[PDB]
Amino acid sequence: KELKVLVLCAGSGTSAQLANAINEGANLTEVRVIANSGAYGAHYDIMGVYDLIILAPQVRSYYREMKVDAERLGIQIVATRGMEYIHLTKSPSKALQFVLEHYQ
């Protein structure tokens, strides 16, 4: 199966920056990964479709509660901080590596 990644932000659209980087890295490297983006709060019914959910910096405060929500489905959850996240958005290769290192 293709690895399914959801990047969530607080609605600024910053999540799309990381989804795009992941997808470009996946495409160029020819690895089976797709990333989508969305707003935190639109995810409660769709989260089970995904294997890995990445919180953008501005939704880091929801990490603990999202981990509890993830526990019934065994979804991997990762939170990011600002400098880390922005560096990933600028590097498809690093963005892809980040995804895979968080889904071993």
- Report the C-alpha gap between 100 and 104 in whole angstroms: 6
The CATH number for 68's domain is 3.40.50.2300
What is the rounded CA–CA span in Å between residue 50 and residue 94? 21
CB of 75 closer than 8 Å to CB of 4: no
Q: How many domains does the chain have?
A: 1
- Which of the following is catalytic: 3, 5, 7, 9? 9
9 catalytic per annotation: yes
DSSP string, 49-99: G-SEEEE-GGGGGGHHHHHHHHTTTT-EEEE--HHHHHHHHT-HHHHHHHH
- Tell me the CA distances in angstroms from 87 to 33, 47, 90, 96, one per residue in order: 20, 25, 5, 12
CA distance 32 to 17: 19
The range of the structural domain enclosing residue 19 comes to 1-104
| Determination technique used | X-ray
Beta bridge partners of 49: none
